[PDB]
Coordinates of C-alpha atoms in Angstrom, one line a residue:
Chain A
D8 CA -40.2 -31.4 -83.4
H9 CA -41.1 -30.7 -79.8
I10 CA -39.4 -32.9 -77.2
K11 CA -41.2 -33.2 -73.8
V12 CA -39.5 -35.0 -71.0
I13 CA -42.2 -36.4 -68.8
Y14 CA -40.6 -37.3 -65.4
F15 CA -41.2 -37.1 -61.7
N16 CA -37.9 -37.3 -59.8
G17 CA -35.8 -34.1 -59.9
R18 CA -32.6 -36.1 -60.4
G19 CA -33.6 -39.6 -61.4
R20 CA -33.5 -41.7 -64.6
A21 CA -34.4 -38.6 -66.7
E22 CA -31.0 -36.9 -66.0
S23 CA -29.4 -39.1 -68.7
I24 CA -32.0 -37.8 -71.2
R25 CA -31.5 -34.2 -70.4
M26 CA -27.7 -34.4 -70.3
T27 CA -27.7 -36.1 -73.6
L28 CA -29.9 -33.4 -75.2
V29 CA -28.0 -30.6 -73.5
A30 CA -24.6 -31.9 -74.8
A31 CA -26.1 -32.3 -78.3
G32 CA -27.6 -28.8 -78.3
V33 CA -31.2 -30.1 -78.6
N34 CA -33.9 -28.1 -76.9
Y35 CA -36.6 -29.8 -74.8
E36 CA -39.4 -29.1 -72.3
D37 CA -39.6 -30.4 -68.8
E38 CA -43.0 -31.7 -67.6
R39 CA -42.7 -32.9 -64.0
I40 CA -45.6 -35.1 -62.8
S41 CA -46.6 -34.7 -59.1
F42 CA -47.3 -37.5 -56.7
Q43 CA -50.9 -36.5 -56.6
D44 CA -51.3 -36.2 -60.3
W45 CA -49.8 -39.6 -61.2
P46 CA -53.0 -41.8 -60.8
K47 CA -54.8 -39.8 -63.5
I48 CA -51.7 -39.3 -65.7
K49 CA -50.5 -42.9 -65.8
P50 CA -53.2 -44.2 -68.1
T51 CA -52.2 -41.6 -70.6
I52 CA -48.5 -42.7 -70.6
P53 CA -47.9 -45.8 -72.8
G54 CA -46.5 -48.5 -70.5
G55 CA -47.5 -46.7 -67.3
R56 CA -44.0 -46.0 -66.3
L57 CA -41.9 -42.8 -66.0
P58 CA -39.8 -41.2 -67.3
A59 CA -41.0 -41.0 -70.9
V60 CA -40.3 -38.8 -73.9
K61 CA -43.2 -37.3 -75.9
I62 CA -42.3 -36.0 -79.4
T63 CA -44.7 -33.8 -81.3
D64 CA -43.9 -32.7 -84.8
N65 CA -45.0 -29.6 -86.8
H66 CA -48.4 -31.3 -87.6
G67 CA -49.3 -32.4 -84.0
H68 CA -48.5 -36.0 -84.6
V69 CA -47.2 -37.8 -81.4
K70 CA -44.7 -40.6 -81.0
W71 CA -43.8 -42.0 -77.6
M72 CA -40.4 -43.1 -76.4
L73 CA -39.9 -45.4 -73.3
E74 CA -37.1 -46.8 -71.2
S75 CA -35.0 -43.8 -70.2
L76 CA -31.6 -45.4 -71.0
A77 CA -32.8 -46.7 -74.3
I78 CA -34.0 -43.1 -75.1
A79 CA -30.6 -41.7 -74.1
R80 CA -28.9 -44.3 -76.3
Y81 CA -31.0 -43.3 -79.4
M82 CA -30.4 -39.6 -78.8
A83 CA -26.7 -40.2 -78.3
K84 CA -26.4 -42.4 -81.3
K85 CA -28.0 -39.8 -83.6
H86 CA -25.6 -37.1 -82.3
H87 CA -22.4 -39.2 -82.4
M88 CA -22.1 -39.9 -78.7
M89 CA -22.0 -43.8 -78.7
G90 CA -18.5 -44.3 -80.2
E91 CA -17.3 -43.8 -83.7
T92 CA -16.1 -47.4 -84.1
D93 CA -17.6 -50.7 -83.0
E94 CA -14.7 -51.1 -80.5
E95 CA -15.4 -47.7 -79.0
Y96 CA -19.1 -48.6 -79.0
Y97 CA -18.2 -51.5 -76.7
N98 CA -16.1 -49.4 -74.4
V99 CA -19.1 -47.0 -74.1
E100 CA -21.4 -49.8 -73.1
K101 CA -18.8 -51.3 -70.8
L102 CA -18.7 -48.3 -68.6
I103 CA -22.5 -47.9 -68.9
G104 CA -23.0 -51.4 -67.6
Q105 CA -20.7 -50.7 -64.7
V106 CA -22.5 -47.4 -64.0
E107 CA -25.8 -49.3 -64.1
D108 CA -24.5 -51.7 -61.4
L109 CA -23.7 -48.7 -59.2
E110 CA -27.1 -47.2 -59.9
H111 CA -28.6 -50.5 -59.0
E112 CA -27.0 -50.3 -55.5
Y113 CA -28.0 -46.7 -55.1
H114 CA -31.6 -47.5 -56.0
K115 CA -31.9 -49.8 -53.0
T116 CA -32.0 -46.8 -50.6
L117 CA -34.7 -44.8 -52.5
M118 CA -38.2 -44.3 -51.1
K119 CA -37.6 -46.0 -47.8
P120 CA -38.2 -44.8 -44.2
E121 CA -35.4 -42.8 -42.6
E122 CA -34.3 -45.7 -40.5
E123 CA -34.3 -48.2 -43.4
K124 CA -32.6 -45.8 -45.8
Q125 CA -29.7 -45.2 -43.4
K126 CA -29.3 -49.0 -43.0
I127 CA -29.2 -49.8 -46.7
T128 CA -26.9 -46.8 -47.3
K129 CA -24.6 -48.1 -44.6
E130 CA -24.5 -51.5 -46.3
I131 CA -23.7 -50.5 -49.9
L132 CA -21.1 -47.9 -48.9
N133 CA -19.2 -50.7 -47.1
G134 CA -20.0 -53.1 -49.9
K135 CA -20.5 -52.9 -53.6
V136 CA -20.2 -49.1 -54.0
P137 CA -16.4 -48.9 -53.3
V138 CA -15.9 -52.1 -55.3
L139 CA -17.8 -50.8 -58.4
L140 CA -16.0 -47.4 -58.1
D141 CA -12.7 -49.2 -58.5
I142 CA -13.9 -51.0 -61.6
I143 CA -15.1 -47.7 -63.0
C144 CA -11.8 -46.1 -62.0
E145 CA -9.9 -48.8 -64.0
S146 CA -12.1 -48.3 -67.1
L147 CA -11.2 -44.6 -67.1
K148 CA -7.5 -45.4 -67.0
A149 CA -7.8 -47.7 -70.0
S150 CA -9.3 -44.8 -72.1
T151 CA -7.5 -43.5 -75.2
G152 CA -8.3 -39.9 -74.3
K153 CA -9.2 -37.4 -71.5
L154 CA -12.7 -38.7 -71.2
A155 CA -14.3 -42.1 -70.5
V156 CA -14.1 -43.4 -74.1
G157 CA -11.8 -41.6 -76.5
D158 CA -11.5 -37.8 -76.4
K159 CA -15.1 -36.6 -77.2
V160 CA -18.3 -36.7 -75.2
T161 CA -20.2 -40.1 -75.1
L162 CA -23.1 -41.4 -73.2
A163 CA -20.8 -43.1 -70.8
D164 CA -19.5 -39.7 -69.7
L165 CA -23.0 -38.4 -68.8
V166 CA -24.3 -41.5 -67.0
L167 CA -21.1 -41.4 -64.9
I168 CA -21.8 -37.9 -63.8
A169 CA -25.3 -38.8 -62.8
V170 CA -24.2 -41.8 -60.7
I171 CA -21.5 -39.9 -59.0
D172 CA -24.0 -37.3 -57.9
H173 CA -26.1 -40.1 -56.6
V174 CA -23.2 -41.5 -54.6
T175 CA -22.5 -38.0 -53.1
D176 CA -26.2 -38.0 -52.2
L177 CA -25.6 -40.9 -49.9
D178 CA -22.3 -39.4 -48.6
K179 CA -20.8 -36.1 -49.7
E180 CA -17.4 -37.2 -48.3
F181 CA -17.2 -40.6 -50.0
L182 CA -15.0 -39.3 -52.9
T183 CA -13.1 -36.7 -50.9
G184 CA -9.4 -37.4 -51.4
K185 CA -10.2 -40.7 -53.2
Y186 CA -10.6 -41.8 -56.8
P187 CA -8.5 -39.1 -58.6
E188 CA -9.4 -40.4 -62.0
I189 CA -13.1 -39.8 -61.3
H190 CA -12.5 -36.2 -60.2
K191 CA -10.4 -35.6 -63.3
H192 CA -13.1 -37.0 -65.5
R193 CA -15.6 -34.5 -64.4
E194 CA -13.1 -31.7 -64.9
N195 CA -12.3 -32.9 -68.4
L196 CA -15.9 -33.4 -69.3
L197 CA -16.9 -30.0 -68.0
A198 CA -14.1 -28.4 -70.2
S199 CA -15.0 -30.6 -73.2
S200 CA -18.7 -29.6 -73.0
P201 CA -19.5 -26.0 -72.0
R202 CA -23.2 -26.6 -72.5
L203 CA -23.0 -29.5 -69.9
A204 CA -21.2 -27.2 -67.5
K205 CA -23.9 -24.5 -67.7
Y206 CA -26.7 -27.1 -67.2
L207 CA -24.9 -28.5 -64.1
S208 CA -24.1 -25.1 -62.7
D209 CA -27.6 -23.7 -63.3
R210 CA -29.1 -26.8 -61.9
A211 CA -27.2 -26.3 -58.6
Chain B
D7 CA -52.6 -49.9 -30.4
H8 CA -50.4 -49.8 -33.5
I9 CA -49.9 -46.5 -35.2
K10 CA -48.8 -46.6 -38.9
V11 CA -47.9 -43.3 -40.6
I12 CA -48.6 -43.8 -44.3
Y13 CA -46.7 -41.0 -46.2
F14 CA -44.6 -40.4 -49.3
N15 CA -42.4 -37.3 -48.8
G16 CA -39.4 -37.9 -46.6
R17 CA -39.9 -34.4 -45.0
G18 CA -43.4 -33.3 -45.9
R19 CA -46.7 -33.0 -44.0
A20 CA -46.0 -36.2 -42.0
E21 CA -43.2 -34.5 -40.0
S22 CA -45.7 -32.8 -37.7
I23 CA -47.2 -36.2 -37.0
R24 CA -43.9 -37.9 -36.2
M25 CA -42.5 -35.0 -34.1
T26 CA -45.7 -34.9 -32.1
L27 CA -45.5 -38.7 -31.4
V28 CA -41.8 -38.5 -30.7
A29 CA -42.1 -35.7 -28.2
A30 CA -45.0 -37.5 -26.5
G31 CA -43.0 -40.7 -26.3
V32 CA -45.5 -42.7 -28.5
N33 CA -44.1 -45.4 -30.8
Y34 CA -45.2 -45.6 -34.4
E35 CA -44.3 -47.3 -37.7
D36 CA -43.3 -45.6 -40.9
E37 CA -44.8 -46.9 -44.2
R38 CA -43.5 -44.9 -47.1
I39 CA -45.5 -45.2 -50.4
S40 CA -43.4 -45.1 -53.6
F41 CA -44.4 -43.1 -56.7
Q42 CA -44.9 -46.3 -58.6
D43 CA -47.0 -47.9 -55.8
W44 CA -49.4 -45.0 -55.4
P45 CA -51.9 -45.8 -58.2
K46 CA -52.8 -49.2 -56.5
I47 CA -52.5 -48.0 -52.9
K48 CA -54.7 -44.9 -53.3
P49 CA -58.0 -46.7 -53.5
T50 CA -57.2 -48.4 -50.2
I51 CA -56.5 -45.0 -48.4
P52 CA -59.8 -43.3 -47.3
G53 CA -60.0 -39.9 -49.1
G54 CA -57.2 -40.8 -51.5
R55 CA -54.7 -38.4 -50.1
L56 CA -51.5 -38.7 -48.2
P57 CA -50.3 -38.6 -45.4
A58 CA -52.7 -40.7 -43.4
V59 CA -52.5 -42.5 -40.0
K60 CA -53.7 -46.1 -39.7
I61 CA -54.4 -47.3 -36.1
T62 CA -54.8 -51.0 -35.4
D63 CA -55.8 -52.2 -31.9
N64 CA -55.1 -55.5 -30.1
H65 CA -58.0 -57.1 -32.0
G66 CA -57.1 -56.0 -35.5
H67 CA -59.8 -53.3 -35.8
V68 CA -58.7 -50.4 -38.0
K69 CA -59.6 -46.7 -37.7
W70 CA -58.4 -44.2 -40.2
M71 CA -57.2 -40.6 -39.5
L72 CA -56.8 -38.0 -42.2
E73 CA -55.6 -34.4 -42.6
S74 CA -52.1 -34.4 -41.3
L75 CA -52.4 -31.2 -39.2
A76 CA -55.7 -32.3 -37.7
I77 CA -54.0 -35.6 -36.8
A78 CA -51.1 -33.7 -35.1
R79 CA -53.7 -31.5 -33.3
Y80 CA -55.5 -34.6 -31.8
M81 CA -52.2 -36.3 -30.8
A82 CA -50.9 -33.1 -29.2
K83 CA -54.2 -32.4 -27.4
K84 CA -54.2 -35.9 -25.9
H85 CA -50.6 -35.4 -24.6
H86 CA -51.0 -31.8 -23.4
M87 CA -49.2 -30.0 -26.2
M88 CA -52.0 -27.6 -27.3
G89 CA -51.9 -25.2 -24.4
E90 CA -53.2 -25.7 -20.8
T91 CA -55.5 -22.7 -20.9
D92 CA -57.8 -21.4 -23.6
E93 CA -55.6 -18.3 -24.0
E94 CA -52.5 -20.5 -24.4
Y95 CA -54.5 -22.6 -26.9
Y96 CA -55.1 -19.5 -29.0
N97 CA -51.4 -18.5 -28.9
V98 CA -50.6 -22.1 -30.1
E99 CA -53.0 -21.7 -33.0
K100 CA -51.7 -18.2 -33.7
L101 CA -48.2 -19.4 -34.5
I102 CA -49.5 -22.5 -36.3
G103 CA -51.5 -20.3 -38.6
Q104 CA -48.5 -18.1 -39.3
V105 CA -46.4 -21.2 -39.9
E106 CA -49.1 -22.5 -42.3
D107 CA -48.8 -19.3 -44.3
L108 CA -45.0 -19.8 -44.5
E109 CA -45.6 -23.5 -45.5
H110 CA -48.0 -22.2 -48.1
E111 CA -45.3 -20.1 -49.8
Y112 CA -42.8 -23.0 -49.6
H113 CA -45.2 -25.4 -51.2
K114 CA -45.3 -23.3 -54.4
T115 CA -41.8 -24.5 -55.3
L116 CA -42.5 -28.2 -54.8
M117 CA -42.6 -30.6 -57.7
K118 CA -41.7 -28.1 -60.4
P119 CA -39.0 -28.2 -63.2
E120 CA -35.6 -27.0 -62.1
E121 CA -36.0 -23.7 -64.0
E122 CA -39.5 -23.1 -62.5
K123 CA -38.5 -24.1 -59.0
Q124 CA -35.6 -21.6 -59.0
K125 CA -38.0 -18.8 -60.2
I126 CA -40.6 -19.4 -57.6
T127 CA -38.0 -19.8 -54.9
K128 CA -36.5 -16.4 -56.0
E129 CA -39.9 -14.8 -55.7
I130 CA -41.0 -15.9 -52.2
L131 CA -37.5 -15.4 -50.7
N132 CA -37.7 -11.7 -51.8
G133 CA -41.4 -11.6 -50.9
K134 CA -43.6 -13.2 -48.2
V135 CA -40.9 -15.5 -46.6
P136 CA -39.0 -12.6 -44.9
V137 CA -42.3 -10.9 -44.0
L138 CA -43.8 -14.0 -42.4
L139 CA -40.5 -14.8 -40.6
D140 CA -40.7 -11.3 -38.9
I141 CA -44.3 -12.1 -37.8
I142 CA -43.2 -15.4 -36.4
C143 CA -40.3 -13.7 -34.8
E144 CA -42.6 -11.2 -33.0
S145 CA -44.9 -14.0 -31.8
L146 CA -41.9 -15.8 -30.2
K147 CA -41.0 -12.5 -28.4
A148 CA -44.5 -12.3 -26.9
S149 CA -44.2 -15.7 -25.3
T150 CA -44.3 -16.2 -21.5
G151 CA -41.5 -18.7 -21.6
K152 CA -38.4 -20.0 -23.4
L153 CA -40.6 -21.7 -26.1
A154 CA -43.2 -20.6 -28.6
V155 CA -46.1 -20.7 -26.1
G156 CA -45.4 -20.9 -22.4
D157 CA -42.4 -23.0 -21.2
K158 CA -43.4 -26.5 -22.3
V159 CA -43.5 -28.2 -25.7
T160 CA -46.6 -27.5 -27.8
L161 CA -47.6 -28.2 -31.4
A162 CA -46.5 -24.7 -32.4
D163 CA -42.9 -25.6 -31.4
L164 CA -42.8 -28.6 -33.8
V165 CA -44.5 -27.1 -36.8
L166 CA -42.0 -24.2 -36.6
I167 CA -39.0 -26.5 -36.7
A168 CA -40.5 -28.2 -39.8
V169 CA -41.1 -25.0 -41.7
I170 CA -37.7 -23.6 -40.8
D171 CA -36.1 -26.7 -42.3
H172 CA -38.2 -26.1 -45.4
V173 CA -36.9 -22.5 -45.6
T174 CA -33.3 -23.8 -45.3
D175 CA -34.1 -26.2 -48.1
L176 CA -34.7 -23.2 -50.3
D177 CA -31.6 -21.4 -49.0
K178 CA -29.3 -22.7 -46.3
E179 CA -28.0 -19.1 -45.7
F180 CA -31.3 -17.3 -45.3
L181 CA -31.3 -17.4 -41.5
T182 CA -27.5 -17.1 -41.1
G183 CA -26.9 -14.1 -38.8
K184 CA -30.6 -13.2 -38.9
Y185 CA -33.7 -13.9 -36.7
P186 CA -31.9 -14.6 -33.4
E187 CA -35.2 -15.5 -31.7
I188 CA -35.8 -18.3 -34.2
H189 CA -32.3 -19.8 -33.6
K190 CA -32.8 -19.6 -29.8
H191 CA -36.2 -21.3 -30.1
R192 CA -34.6 -24.4 -31.7
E193 CA -31.9 -24.4 -29.0
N194 CA -34.6 -24.1 -26.2
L195 CA -36.8 -26.7 -27.8
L196 CA -33.9 -29.2 -28.3
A197 CA -33.0 -28.8 -24.6
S198 CA -36.7 -29.0 -23.5
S199 CA -37.2 -32.3 -25.5
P200 CA -34.3 -34.8 -25.5
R201 CA -36.5 -37.2 -27.5
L202 CA -37.0 -34.5 -30.2
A203 CA -33.2 -33.9 -30.3
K204 CA -32.4 -37.6 -30.9
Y205 CA -35.0 -37.8 -33.6
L206 CA -33.6 -34.7 -35.4
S207 CA -30.0 -35.9 -35.0
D208 CA -30.7 -39.4 -36.1
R209 CA -32.7 -38.1 -39.1
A210 CA -29.7 -36.1 -40.2

């Protein structure tokens, strides 16, 4: 099969797809759609929304996958990254839901004028961002291993890395000297996944 | 009149429009179009390309302006930022054309996958970027004043600031310890235009 990740934002909703495929050792192809190319490409994408995954098999047959986080869930489930037990599966979804709430606050500042972006960034950083970070910090403490859920890589580990990079995009010093469990999670995940470390370092 | 700057990129071709209006003391309104809103907004924009300037007068009448650099030229010409003499007008366009060539190389890395962006960035930084910077550096030396052309602010001063920020976007250390005339131009322009300094500092 040939997996093509059709996206637009360099670090948007498609990062959970790539990080899941990178950690699973599955190859893929990046196809970034430009702002000027989107009007003519959108009718070709089922649903008309990005990101989307296009899978082509050895015979040229095409099947389309939508809803970035649903794609990452399916790829992580097939490669044992959604919890081995039902209780671990809940803990994976518990941190994912908390990360989604933090991604929801970060999304409020995207694609706004410079004056409006700084205002909304100023509100969430003094509002729900530190509150949600404490909830995420408590979920990491309740884990049975060095990672978010258990001791091996799950989807909750990868969506957490993406949302923390989004938080640092709003303020590079928001986590400096704070949230030690979040900093130790990145160190433990980077050591537990050498392929994830190479992707993150080469992306920088 | 009410000037609306319809754009998409936070720091793209619309920066020359804003910096020209800021230095001239003319108020404007930012209207950023999102990637998801572009398919339905494009038929409303004459020409179907961004950025574009929408001017509404006291009676609601609308006149449209296209081609970002042509808009900046008209606004700079009306506020005496295109040279007082014909020979100064040539020197303004001389550095603008050299900046456009450097913007042309920077545009090759935009909206590409992470692997492809790093490759093209690696080629221009070892190619035309240092060559064009030397040509821009020599044009600054031949000036009759502390700025790019003469002693007062012109459009060549502002497009140079925008292209240098684009170069630092590719590599923050490309100008460290190199090109002293380029660093002194930003210092002289910031002192010659307090409104430009506030815009640049508030934008950061």
